[PDB]
């Protein structure tokens, strides 16, 4: 049926991050960010290219690239390092892979691929 619309990576706010990023249906990579975070602005290229490929290649119904505004949405988890990249596997949604977030897609693949249960790589 219908496929595609706007923004590949599922930017799930803290409001739904427990419904989309915390879903055991697949491995979800949540990248906490902000609107003024120059870092996220550099991480988006990978989030749109990876997210798009993850949501439009051979895993669109599998490991999904998620995001959330750590400054626009009150998350239930604390963050000592802004931004952050938590990976909620499809089995370990209770002890995700909290991260700092870098500017590399290769590390992302190996991320949910070594951090993920689905091993999307």
From Swiss-Prot:
Residues 6-117 form the Thioredoxin domain. Disulfide bonds join 37-40. It is found in: Endoplasmic reticulum lumen. The keyword Endoplasmic reticulum applies. Keywords: Disulfide bond, Endoplasmic reticulum, Isomerase, Redox-active center, Repeat, Signal. One of its GO terms (cellular component) is endoplasmic reticulum lumen. The record marks 103 as: Lowers pKa of C-terminal Cys of second active site. The active site is at residues 37, 40. GO terms for biological process: protein folding; response to endoplasmic reticulum stress. The record marks 38-39 as: Contributes to redox potential value. The keyword Protein biosynthesis does not apply. One of its GO terms (molecular function) is protein disulfide isomerase activity. Participates in the folding of proteins containing disulfide bonds, may be involved in glycosylation, prolyl hydroxylation and triglyceride transfer. Belongs to the protein disulfide isomerase family. This is Protein disulfide-isomerase. It comes from Humicola insolens.
